[PDB]
Amino acid sequence: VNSFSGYLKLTDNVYIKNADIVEEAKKVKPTVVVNAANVYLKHGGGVAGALNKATNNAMQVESDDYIATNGPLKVGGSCVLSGHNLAKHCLHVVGPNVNKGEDIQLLKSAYENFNQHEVLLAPLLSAGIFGADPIHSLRVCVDTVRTNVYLAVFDKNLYDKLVSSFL
């Protein structure tokens, strides 16, 4: 048993809810919250800016030190950093950004990072402002992630369609 409430069960291991990932993280304090990161860990908007704002910019301060030491992530890659006041850990995962021209095939690689964690609270990778179709992102998630993932979908209308079209 765990603390996640009101999720629809899609598969053995994937659950979904219409919710802001920030409000869910603040209420649940999960072991792992996933950030929809970019390779520079510049958290300006979308899930990254919302999460970073909720940490009072501590996520960005920590991220800038990570980049100064290690250099940028890969598209499809990830790093584990603090979850600050939201979670124990934040898994920063870089899905491909269609609005920058990146290979959508890298979305599977991105979701493979989730398999290193038994339970995660996550957004739909590469969806929202990253330009991919969230229906596609959900399908790749279900077909790639084997650990237990609780997906928070901010947008009510896209959430309604993601459920109603799920195969």
Ligand SMILES: COc1cc(Cn2cnc(N)c3ncnc2-3)on1
């Ligand atoms: C346009 O539709 C969208 C966009 C997104 C991405 N996203 C953005 N900011 C949030 N605070 C989220 N929490 C869950 N997902 C979040 O979700 N649905």
